[PDB]
């Protein structure tokens, strides 16, 4: 089978629309938080580059080579474990699946631009985190689906 | 010239990613959706359905026939004008062009899902509004680019 070939998920361009699916996601203040910082995370997660139409599980990616305009991903923080960073222009628009029950980031009232964080062990194991303020969507398991638009590398 | 044909902009399906461009937008207080409510608006505006790749100006869209899954938009009247409504799951992720200077909606800390409003006179004249809280991006002209994901009709 030889289908149509498009640009891969690991290749990101500044401006691409990112769709992440976080099934059975849980609330956290100990994984990516030293004192008291919030985010929703999920063991199994799917990341789609809506622009290309290409999609793949986080756990099934080689985050070592995930690039942004010919440059591997940045790593500002490392609270709890190693954290790959996918930056975005604006904030993260995420929601509780099916319902209009929307979610809001930690910097809910600042001109700060949110980023996506991914933990990777090096082989077949990955979690995806998305900034939050409180349990606006629940304690967990909570099926979430977020959306955003990549920004330029610092 | 007959190039490759895709699904139109006027036809929306709940889940489509919407990319809004509000070139040189202004801040507006008692002028949109409800009394004493903030939002950024643009005369000239471009709406792209990132999923299909189809895009067009707001002023060049027959909002009379803009549908969502075979159902015309829920046009709702405001204190003044009558407005067309494009609902979204989650919130609106908008930003000041180029910079990481992000924006935030009026319901910045609620599980409320934001919607896109368009005013249309009936022929060749259409503004696009996007919810805001204060002049986080400026007074205007301010070039904004927003993003979101279509929701189900009520």
């Amino acid at each position, epitope marked *: 089978d030889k289908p149509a070939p498009a640009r891969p998920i690991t290749n990101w361009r500044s401006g691409d629309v990112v769709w992440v699916t976080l099934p059975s996601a849980e609330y956290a203040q100990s994984q990516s938080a030293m*004192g008291s910082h919030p985010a929703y995370w999920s063991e199994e997660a799917t990341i789609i580059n809506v622009a290309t139409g290409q999609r793949a599980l986080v756990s099934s990616i080689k985050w070592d080579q995930v690039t942004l305009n010919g440059k591997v991903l940045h790593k500002e923080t490392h609270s709890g474990l190693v954290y790959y960073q996918l930056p975005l222009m604006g904030k993260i628009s995420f929601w509780q699946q099916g319902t209009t029950k929307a979610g809001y980031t930690y910097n809910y009232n600042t001109t700060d631009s949110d980023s996506l964080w991914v933990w990777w062990d090096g082989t077949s194991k990955g979690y995806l985190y998305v900034s939050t*303020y409180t349990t606006m969507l629940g304690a967990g398991p909570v099926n979430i689906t977020g959306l955003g638009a990549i920004g330029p590398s610092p | 010239d007959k190039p490759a044909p895709a699904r139109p902009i006027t036809n929306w399906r709940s889940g489509d990613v919407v990319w809004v461009t509000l070139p040189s937008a202004e801040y507006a207080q008692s002028q949109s959706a409800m009394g004493s409510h903030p939002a950024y608006w643009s005369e000239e505006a471009t709406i792209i359905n990132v999923a299909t790749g189809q895009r067009a100006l707001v002023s060049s869209i027959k909002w009379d026939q803009v549908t969502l899954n075979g159902k015309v938009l829920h046009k709702e009247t405001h204190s003044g004008l009558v407005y067309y409504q494009l609902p979204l799951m989650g919130k609106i992720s908008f930003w000041q062009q180029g910079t990481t200077k992000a924006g935030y909606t009026y319901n910045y*800390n609620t599980t409320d899902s934001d919607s896109l409003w368009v005013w249309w006179d009936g022929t060749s004249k259409g503004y696009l509004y996007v919810s805001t809280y*204060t002049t986080m991006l400026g007074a205007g002209p301010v070039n904004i680019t927003g993003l979101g994901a279509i929701g189900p009709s009520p």
Partner: antibody, heavy 117, light 110 residues
Framework: VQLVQSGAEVKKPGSSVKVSCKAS????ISWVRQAPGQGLEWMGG????????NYAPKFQDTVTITADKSTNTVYMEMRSLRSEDTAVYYC???????????????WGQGTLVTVSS | ALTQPASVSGSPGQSITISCTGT?????????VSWYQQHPGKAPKLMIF???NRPSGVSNRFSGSKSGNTASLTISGLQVEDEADYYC???????????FGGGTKLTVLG
């Protein structure tokens, strides 16, 4: 959501006492003491739906806040009491008809913690 | 604690501003400053939240503000039932989780 608090708790200098804070989704019941004359100083901030209490760095060694998930209630246990601990204490969630943020509202009636011999 | 004075007084037909200066990284960078009103022998009442916002019940007299590193409460058109303590509180995103003000005693001299 409405907050109801426990009555007066008069105790000896060196004992433990639990203060019940009843409520009427996502409520975050915190605690802010009131030293007479001096200004308010926050101490607790448990999230009943998660059950983890992350207290202020000055207290924590005497305040043990738990989360009763059965009847939506939060207890405050101020152990190792003294004349300095003799203060009016309030339980405070964050609410705004729909919003949730970095603030306090509504507040409890105020448990009178009179600690003296 | 937050750097907030207590000596605020004036005429009823005048406006006032209460300074609330915190760290350069927890006022100018992060904005979550909330204000309360303590009437004699009563539990605090929410007046302002997230720098600029009022609940449905607080009169339009109150107006929040953020001037770089100093936040201020603006009460224009003073009222006779406003003799109470006024506080400001930003959830500082540092080692200290929540920081309260000094408590401004409002005595509208009349």
């Amino acid at each position: 959501v409405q907050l109801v608090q426990s009555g007066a708790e008069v105790k000896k200098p060196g004992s433990s006492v639990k203060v019940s804070c009843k409520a009427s989704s996502s409520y975050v019941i915190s605690w802010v003491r009131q030293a007479p004359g001096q200004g308010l100083e926050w101490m607790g901030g448990i999230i009943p739906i998660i059950g983890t209490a992350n207290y202020a760095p000055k207290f924590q060694d005497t305040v043990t806040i738990t989360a009763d998930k059965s009847t939506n209630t939060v207890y405050m246990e101020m152990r190792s009491l003294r004349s300095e601990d003799t203060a009016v204490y309030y339980c405070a969630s964050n609410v705004q008809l729909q919003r949730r943020g970095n603030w306090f509202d509504p507040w409890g009636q105020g448990t009178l913690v009179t600690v003296s011999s | 604690a937050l750097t907030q004075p207590a000596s605020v007084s004036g005429s009823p037909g005048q406006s006032i501003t209460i300074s609330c200066t915190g760290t350069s990284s927890d006022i100018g960078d992060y904005n979550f400053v909330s204000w309360y009103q303590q009437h004699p022998g009563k539990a605090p009442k929410l007046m302002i939240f997230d720098v600029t916002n009022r609940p449905s019940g607080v009169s339009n007299r109150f107006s929040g503000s953020k001037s770089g590193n100093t936040a201020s409460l603006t009460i224009s058109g003073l009222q006779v039932e406003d003799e109470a303590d006024y506080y400001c509180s930003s959830y500082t995103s540092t080692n200290t989780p929540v920081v309260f003000g000094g408590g401004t005693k409002l005595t509208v001299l009349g």
